[PDB]
Amino acid sequence: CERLPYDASKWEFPRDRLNLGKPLGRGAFGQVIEADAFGIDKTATCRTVAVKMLKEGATHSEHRALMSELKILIHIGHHLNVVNLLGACTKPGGPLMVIVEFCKFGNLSTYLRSKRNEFVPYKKDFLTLEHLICYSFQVAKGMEFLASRKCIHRDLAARNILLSEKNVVKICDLARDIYKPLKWMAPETIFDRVYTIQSDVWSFGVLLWEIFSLGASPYPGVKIDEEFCRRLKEGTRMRAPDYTTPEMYQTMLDCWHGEPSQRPTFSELVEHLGNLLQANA
């Protein structure tokens, strides 16, 4: 994948126009940090951005990984409902840095949990059914986009959905091709370790359950063991979450169809959720 091209003219950002701020996360692969970037959208403005940068030193593997991730992001292109690439610092004499949009409210599951006593179905800063269906609609749109670029997301879950201003949600993009988180996995993946876009439709149903439980853990008080997998195969499903509509629960069950080809597609979900948005609003 580091074999796809890197057009520096289009993507390269000067390191002296990045001012690094607080770390958002770290791991045995990289470090993600908040930064202020001047002129990253060509305009004479500062924008807060998110930067993924390598570790203190080398590894070739880790270098190729981040570099491949950059090229994938370029290859996929832009959509409102994914975390978009803004630029990169790849030239010699500094660390490899990949620069993406910053989502200032962080991950969706943590956020929803924080609004459990600030929620009203209809009627301040309160969450309402409109908001939850709007988020669901947005993620579907994001996944419809990834699908059209022939990606699967290995971990479609509320923790991997970030929230920006103006209620915009973005899939934090785990992005592989036609591919070969147990509570989020389709049964054909659990048993065959294989991921397709229809496997993501299953995970999206679990994500919907997360949204309409306001950030609860899936399969409450259930052991993820040999039984759980037997139960899922036989057709056992989660019960409705506390804040769901009937139609949203029906959609969850649709997404959890045993046969992958009987699950709706993301396009179908975008349509259906758009009508629920209009029926609510």
Ligand SMILES: COc1cc(Nc2nccc(Nc3ccc4c(C)n[nH]c4c3)n2)cc(OC)c1OC
């Ligand atoms: C969820 O963590 C936050 C993300 C953000 N916002 C954000 N925008 C774009 C990319 C990005 N990457 C990113 C960072 C950190 C992590 C960890 C850890 N796992 N995966 C991660 C991905 N993050 C803002 C935050 O503060 C507002 C966060 O912490 C509350």
